[PDB]
Amino acid sequence: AAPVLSITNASVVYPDGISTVTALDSANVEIFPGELVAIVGESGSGKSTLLSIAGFLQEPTSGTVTLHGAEGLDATSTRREHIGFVFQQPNLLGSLTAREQLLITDHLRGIKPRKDRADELLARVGLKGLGGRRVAQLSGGQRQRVNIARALMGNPQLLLADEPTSALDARLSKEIVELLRDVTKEFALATLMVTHDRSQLAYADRFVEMADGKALQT
């Protein structure tokens, strides 16, 4: 079984005026289909930085990231067709309704929006009947799950979830990570999921713990 994603010896270095900050240092990550790999570590250890290059949001300053079955494609087309993002902040577009937050991903991927697909995914994250809400009429956790539902709207092979339960109560956060692994298993997805709720490791096949930008021995 070939990996879906290979992060081979990757680093990110930002300039801090005179000095420089090494957000990520020599990351080596490889994930295969049907795997859900959790990512643990303290605030500021590099968890989102790892997903940012995993998701082709930026090229690494050293080393390479390869999504196979998408080599020979630019970063943008790779994200559009093969990756789903659950950003740390909800990142909802201001003028759309919850339902349309999902529909627009169909639009940018060049297919006619499927209206029924969206209310099902909205129902799955516990938001039935809230499809008409605007971002202002949604709570911090409700926004987060609109964020979540939007990531499952396409047919990616790589799912990147960045603390997707931060704004969720104990009961709902557990259903979200059951949701995430279930789709991981059903569609042979490669999923990385950052979380501070270490109880959730039970739903992960492996996990990477991180400190000061480095992955540690596990």
Binding site: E59, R79, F85, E100, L108, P113
Partner: protein, 344 residues
Amino acid sequence: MFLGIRDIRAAAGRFALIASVVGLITLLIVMLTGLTQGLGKQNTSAIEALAPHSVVFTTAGGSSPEFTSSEISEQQAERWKDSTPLGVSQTRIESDQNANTTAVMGLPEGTPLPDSVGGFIEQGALLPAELADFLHVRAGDHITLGGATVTVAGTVKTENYSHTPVVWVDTATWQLVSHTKAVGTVLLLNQEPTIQPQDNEVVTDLKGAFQAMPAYKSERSSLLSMQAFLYIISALVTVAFLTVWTLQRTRDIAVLAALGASKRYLLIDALGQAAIILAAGVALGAGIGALLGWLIAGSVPFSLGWVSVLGPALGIWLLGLIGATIAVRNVTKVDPQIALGATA
């Protein structure tokens, strides 16, 4: 185009505000254009009104034709058939109670005048109503025109040569007041010259005929300068300003880019939205233009065609779209992680 058209649904107040700014600028152009095109016809409206196709001048030494130095001899007139001799002079008009200098145009008796002006050429002088009121004279009175006593045959409406209203007189009268045996200053051709002119003659189309008016050249400079600065500044103000407007979407564009939106998708969305708002703004700005302009063209000279209302309108429409293109490009240029960073 999905997000673009509902951004408008969700804040129609701010899109009205932005369309106003475009309409206000389109309106500025359409009135300032029509107000200066009006100032231009203070020198030219009379000859245009006569609607000649070509117009023959007279020079010496192949010089530039000049209305002040051309004369049509009576033999010259019999040569060119289908031609009418026009005399152009500036002279002193004097009534019992007042005086002025004014333009006097001369045509053969019975020549139908352009509908812009009253009726037909009669023996004597036809004064514009405003000149007649200025002089306090009516049809029947006597005036001194170029030192000669002439009878006011009637009043007519106003056309212009060299910033004066034109008094219309029969060729014999024009000969008397301008002190010449010539039958005119030029010959008006309403069809197109079928005969060739001599070494001291020169045929000109109506456009070039203004090059022969001295009051025109020495001010055409000032009017072109205005229409130049107005469009140059407007262009840059419009471009720069659609950038500042489209930039208020950097962040939602950044989010769409992160999810996988191609730059073509994003630019289509952006100018799709911009096309709609700019269309509204120029349509109304040019609308309020024609109505306001037609409303004011009785008290102030205001000439305005249709290439001068819709010429500017589409000029702003595409200039605004490039301004939107500038903005979308400076966001999509960067890796999406940085764009998501420049946003809070």
